[PDB]
Design a protein around this ligand. Structure first.
Ligand code: 43S
Length: 127
C-alpha cells in the first residue's frame, strides 16, 4: 500500500552523453506524447495511496512514467537512445500488466504507444 521512492533521475557517476538521438527523444517523442489529451495519468509516478491501488507496487517492480523520463532527458541522465526507449516501453508494459484489458487507462496507454512507435520509426541516424 505505500509508495516506493521514485526512479533515479540524477547520478553523478553514471556515464552520460548528449546526442542527436537523445535530443530527438526529448524534442519530438517526449514532447508529442506529453501534449496529448491522454498524457495526464502518465506524467508522474503512480501514487498508490492517493489512487487507492495498494497492490500496485506488489505487482509493478520496475515503475516508470513520463515525469521521470522527462527529468532524465532534461538532466542528461542517459547514455543512449535505447535506455530511454526502454523506459517508454516499461511504462506502457507496466500499464498493461497491472490493469484490466479494455480499461480506459489501457486505451490511453495504447494511444500514446501508437504515437511513440510512429515517432521512433523516424529516429535519426547517429551523428
Ligand atoms: N490504474 C492506473 N491508474 C493510473 C493513474 C490514474 C489517475 Br486517476 C491518475 C494518475 C497519475 C499517475 O497514475 C495515474 C495509472 N497511471 C499509469 N498506470 C495507471 N494505472
Amino acid at each position: 500500500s505505500m509508495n516506493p521512492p521514485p526512479p533515479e533521475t540524477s547520478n553523478p557517476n553514471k556515464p552520460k552523453r548528449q546526442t542527436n538521438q537523445l535530443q530527438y527523444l526529448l524534442r519530438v517523442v517526449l514532447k508529442t506524447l506529453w501534449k496529448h489529451q491522454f498524457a495526464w495519468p502518465f506524467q508522474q509516478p503512480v501514487d498508490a495511496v492517493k489512487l487507492n491501488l495498494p497492490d500496485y507496487y506488489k505487482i509493478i517492480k520496475t515503475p516508470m512514467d513520463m515525469g521521470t523520463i522527462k527529468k532524465r532527458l532534461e538532466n542528461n541522465y542517459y547514455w543512449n537512445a535505447q535506455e530511454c526507449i526502454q523506459d517508454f516501453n516499461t511504462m506502457f508494459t507496466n500499464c498493461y500488466i497491472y490493469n484490466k484489458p479494455g480499461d480506459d487507462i489501457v486505451l490511453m496507454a495504447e494511444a500514446l504507444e501508437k504515437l511513440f512507435l510512429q515517432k521512433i520509426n523516424e529516429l535519426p541516424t547517429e551523428e
